Structure formats: structure tokens, C-alpha cells
């Protein structure tokens, strides 16, 4: 036989479940930012190699 | 000569393309994080509304 | 009812603190995103002028 | 053709300068990203504090 206790329990359960969802969302957000951190590092190194190639190209070819 | 310049250029261009791809990936990752933060703003609003309702219903 | 009042006050202040942190975080991400788009534009100016350099001074 | 040397010098300087600008931007971008990563860590901690307060609240007050 349903009473107010049932709805109270449902409300608490929803509160807990939404905390869990927020935790999950936080972890996905940090996962995404770590992907971006790795991508930024890849760009830093790629750009250093590129800068070496520009330097080399202008040094070897004075007409450039 | 022109040969070495040609090869060097080919390499340089393919590296510019790698950098371009990397830039796109980075932007996409950051966009994903921003979407996630929108979700969390709504989720935390749901949490505080749930809490408030809990209080209004079951306390003085 | 007193301890409930104290706990509620605390909880409320922490919700508002989290809300503020979420805004701070979206701001921080927009700053990062802008930085990345600026690098996209910059890297395009760089490859474009490299191309111009080779078109003008090579075969 | 003195003009040629003029233009070529300017163009080379500009290429070098834009490499430098991209280098600077990369460093700053990484800084900005680290800030955001720490903002997310702060929210994890803050929401864990909120979870402890919610747990405690529901545990102490059966009517909630």
C-alpha cells in the first residue's frame, strides 16, 4: 500500500542518482580536457619541428 | 638544387597539414568539454531544485 | 530544527559556490577555445605566406 | 633589385615573426588549458563536499 514514504524514497533516490550523474559528467569533462592537453602538446612539438624546417629552408636557400 | 628544395617543400607542407589536423582535434575536444559543462550546469540546477523541493515539502 | 538550519545554510552556500565554479570554468574554456582559433588563423597566415614565398621566389 | 632585397628581407622577417607568434600562442594556450583543468578538479572536490553534506543531511533527517 503506497504512502508518502514511497514518494519520499523516490525523491531521495533521484537526488542520489543526479549526484552520480554529475560525477560522471565531471569525469567526462576532465577526459575531454586531457585529450585537448595531449593535442596541444602534439601541436607544440609539431610546431617546433616546423620552425626548424623553416629556419633550415631559409638558411639553405638564400633566394627564399 | 631544385630537387632538395622540392623534397623539403613536400615535407614542410605535409607537416603544416598535420598541424592543421591537430588544431581541429584540439578545438573539437574543447567543444566537447564546453558541451559537458552545459550539461553540468543543468544537472547541478536539477540537484538544487530537487533539494529545495525536498525541503519545502518535508521541513518547516 | 536549529542544526537543520545550519546544515541547510552551509549546503546552500556550497551550491552557489559550485554554480560560480561552473561559470568560471565555462569562461576558462572559452578563453582556451579562442586561443586555439587564434592559432588556427595564425597557422593559416603562416602557411599562406610560406606559399607566397615559394610562388614568388622559386619554380 | 635593391627593392628585391628590401621585399625579401621584409618577407623573411615576417615569416620568422609569425613563427614566434604561434610559439607564444601555444605556450599561452597550454596555460589557459591548465587553468581549466584545475577548475574542473576544483568542481570535483566541491561536488564531493556537497555529496557528503547531502548524505549527512538525509542520514540525520529521516523526514528528508
UniProtKB/Swiss-Prot annotation, chain B:
- Subcellular localization, as worded in the UniProt entry: Endoplasmic reticulum membrane
Specify the protein name.
B-cell receptor-associated protein 29
Write out the biased-composition intervals (Basic and acidic residues): 38-55
Subunit: Homodimer. Heterodimer with BCAP31. Binds CASP8 (isoform 9) as a complex containing BCAP31, BCAP29, BCL2 and/or BCL2L1. Interacts with VAMP3, VAMP1 and membrane IgD immunoglobulins. May interact with ACTG1 and non-muscle myosin II.
Q: Which gene encodes it?
A: BCAP29
What protein family is recorded?
Answer: Belongs to the BCAP29/BCAP31 family.
Show the coiled coil region(s): 1-60
The source's superkingdom equals Eukaryota
Q: Where is this region: Disordered?
A: 30-55
Organism of derivation: Homo sapiens
Q: Its biological function?
A: May play a role in anterograde transport of membrane proteins from the endoplasmic reticulum to the Golgi. May be involved in CASP8-mediated apoptosis.
Disulfide pairs?
Answer: none
